[PDB]
Design a protein around this motif. Sequence first.
Motif, mmCIF file in Angstrom:
data_model
loop_
_atom_site.group_PDB
_atom_site.id
_atom_site.type_symbol
_atom_site.label_atom_id
_atom_site.label_comp_id
_atom_site.label_asym_id
_atom_site.label_seq_id
_atom_site.Cartn_x
_atom_site.Cartn_y
_atom_site.Cartn_z
ATOM 1 N N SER F 8 0.863 -1.209 0.000
ATOM 2 C CA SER F 8 0.000 0.000 0.000
ATOM 3 C C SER F 8 0.887 1.241 0.000
ATOM 4 N N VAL F 9 0.590 2.209 -0.869
ATOM 5 C CA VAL F 9 1.275 3.532 -0.880
ATOM 6 C C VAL F 9 0.217 4.628 -0.994
ATOM 7 N N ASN F 10 0.313 5.625 -0.110
ATOM 8 C CA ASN F 10 -0.559 6.824 -0.052
ATOM 9 C C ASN F 10 0.322 8.069 -0.158
ATOM 10 N N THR F 11 -0.128 9.064 -0.922
ATOM 11 C CA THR F 11 0.576 10.358 -1.111
ATOM 12 C C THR F 11 0.508 11.159 0.195
ATOM 13 N N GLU F 12 1.646 11.697 0.656
ATOM 14 C CA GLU F 12 1.778 12.412 1.959
ATOM 15 C C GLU F 12 0.781 13.570 1.994
ATOM 16 N N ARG F 13 -0.269 13.438 2.809
ATOM 17 C CA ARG F 13 -1.257 14.515 3.069
ATOM 18 C C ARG F 13 -0.569 15.600 3.905
ATOM 19 N N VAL F 14 -0.581 16.850 3.430
ATOM 20 C CA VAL F 14 0.084 18.002 4.110
ATOM 21 C C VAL F 14 -0.689 18.280 5.405
ATOM 22 N N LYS F 15 0.030 18.456 6.519
ATOM 23 C CA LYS F 15 -0.547 18.533 7.889
ATOM 24 C C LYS F 15 -1.374 19.808 8.036
ATOM 25 N N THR F 16 -2.530 19.684 8.684
ATOM 26 C CA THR F 16 -3.628 20.676 8.674
ATOM 27 C C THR F 16 -3.838 21.173 10.103
ATOM 28 N N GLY F 17 -3.049 22.165 10.518
ATOM 29 C CA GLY F 17 -3.230 22.861 11.807
ATOM 30 C C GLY F 17 -4.501 23.697 11.808
ATOM 31 N N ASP F 18 -5.172 23.793 12.961
ATOM 32 C CA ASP F 18 -6.410 24.594 13.161
ATOM 33 C C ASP F 18 -6.153 25.580 14.309
ATOM 34 N N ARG F 19 -6.255 26.890 14.043
ATOM 35 C CA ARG F 19 -5.997 27.967 15.038
ATOM 36 C C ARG F 19 -7.000 29.112 14.859
ATOM 37 N N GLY F 20 -7.451 29.695 15.979
ATOM 38 C CA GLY F 20 -8.503 30.730 16.071
ATOM 39 C C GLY F 20 -8.024 31.970 16.811
#
Lengths: 51, 106, 96, 110, 91, 50, 95, 90
Positions: F8-20
């Motif tokens: 199995s190979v998956n393309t690196e999903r770019v990390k999704t920070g959440d800030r308010g």
Amino acid sequence: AYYAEIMKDHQIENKKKKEVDQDKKQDQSMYSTSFKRCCKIMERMVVQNDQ
Amino acid sequence: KAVTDMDINELRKLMIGKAIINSSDMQGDLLQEAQDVIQSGIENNSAPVLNIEAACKYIKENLDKKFGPTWQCIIGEGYAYDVTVQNNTLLFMFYNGNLAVLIFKS
Amino acid sequence: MSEVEDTLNRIKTHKTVLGYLIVNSEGGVVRGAFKDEEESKNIANSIPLLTKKARSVVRDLDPTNDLVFLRIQTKLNEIMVAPDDEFSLIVIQTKG
Amino acid sequence: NADDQLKQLSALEGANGYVIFNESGIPLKRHEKSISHEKAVHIAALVSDLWNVSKKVIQRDLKTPENDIEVIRLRTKHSYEYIITQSGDFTMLAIQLCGKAIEEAKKAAA
Amino acid sequence: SHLDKVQPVIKNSDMSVEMQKEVEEVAKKAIDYCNTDKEIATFIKDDFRSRYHGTWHCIVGRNFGSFVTFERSYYIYLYVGQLAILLFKTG
Amino acid sequence: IAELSEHSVNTERVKTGDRGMSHKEGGWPGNVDPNEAQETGRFKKRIEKS
Amino acid sequence: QQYKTFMGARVLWPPECADDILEGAIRETQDALKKFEIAREGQKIAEHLKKYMDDHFDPYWHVFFGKNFGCQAVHNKNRFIYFYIEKTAFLMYQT
Amino acid sequence: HANEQIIDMPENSEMKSMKNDAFSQAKFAVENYKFENKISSHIKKFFDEKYGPNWHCVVGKHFNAYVSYDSKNFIFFYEGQLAILLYRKG
């Protein structure tokens, strides 16, 4: 926008000053009643600065 | 009376639960869903004084679970923005008085 | 009429006035009565943006209260603008 | 000594409010009649932009080298009059009225 | 001397010190170049999109607040005078 | 038949920070806190010292 | 999971495929991509690569490249090649 | 909203069970697992169980793909935003 919806809500004394204007394309277009006030005010304020 | 009697400080005080839409790039049916959630959402966590962070903590999480994973929502008194968005993924509706709500899906 | 087109002629003839320029609501020149054209073209583009930006200033503080008359004062010159919805009148008067 | 001028400015006929700004944007001192800190932060953002925009435009878009703006007088509906000056780094925005509005304000006080 | 006066301040900067320093100059250059706030937002995005590629979203104003999903180590929030330049890239 | 193996190979999903973050406050310095009354009150008294 | 840079390309370091079939493969994609772009006419360059594999190596290669996807596939012993180039990730496996 | 699909499944001789279970599984697989790799692990595992092995499926938001398959076993459908592709070979 908010004010436009309030006029729609309360149609009591609908805004006049209908956009007939002066028109005529060329040779004195509008140059007439809201703009007259602005011309008259400008004259006085030009004088004011010299006097 | 009517519009002449009505001043800004009277208009805002008279009515807080009014709703007004400016732009609407998103589809007709998906707006009806979001509009109900953001109005109910802000009023809940309006608190004693309006926590603008608190409002957009609630709206962010709600709109992540409801539709898609990367949903971005910002509210403010006044601001300028240019924001690249997908097709039919964006609603801009401001609440009464001094509250401008931009919601989109990136 | 003699009355707008005369008053506009009168303020031009008036001593220590560089020129009066009418701007259209869409940033266009209706009448432009300056000496050099560069100044008139520059005034036609630049000043009506300042008046729209200066209208948003007075508007934010009280959104009932609209701009009736704006006067800037520079080191050498004065710049006086009487904005309306249809047209805006602009003048440049040198300080005495 | 530096407070007495604020007292001297309300004493001038017509004067409602005043708000002073740093080069930054913070309000240094305001009147009690005009809202304190809430409006003073709001009224700074507009005038600091309006000034820096106009300061810029007269030196570039008018093509007049060395001609800095000294005063700005926004006259409005009702009788408001927003005067913007600049002494050194700091700036300020006085608000006066006219005979009609002064008389209205005195009647409201009465 | 206006560049010394503005002195842009950075409350929240989830970004490398080198890329941060670049934003300060662009932020100053944007304001003194631009005639209105709408133009500031447009100039920042377009300048960063050219330098670093992808999908930026830029917001600037007097009074607002911002909960957003961003590419980790691509989010800065700087205020200058009364203008908060907020730029963030998303995937 | 050739022996098969799954990867199995998956393309690196770019990390999704959440800030308010809110910007309702005006533009102060960093060292000074806009909410805190003390911090502001001193900084105003430092400007008036010309 | 640990990637590595060899022949100007970002491949999964433990090379599932044999290191000859991998070298010739990556080099052909880089020399295909120097001609046709992924952004415009991206279907064509896959079909070019697929046919190329069947000519020089055993038949029935599957070719899958995208900016974002995730696959679990069954392949033959030493017939699985997965490499990134710039941002685009190229998967392909023989059957 | 799945405007353009490609359906090359048998349909005739009550093999609609093997096309319908493509649309049915996809919907259940995507909402629960919420990870591109893990979808391709679930849909494949099901289709192998029922219709015998040598199925390859690849799930991505944006990808290009040219491939060899077994005639009347290949279906390409959009489940919501996501674009699922599954097919037999061997």
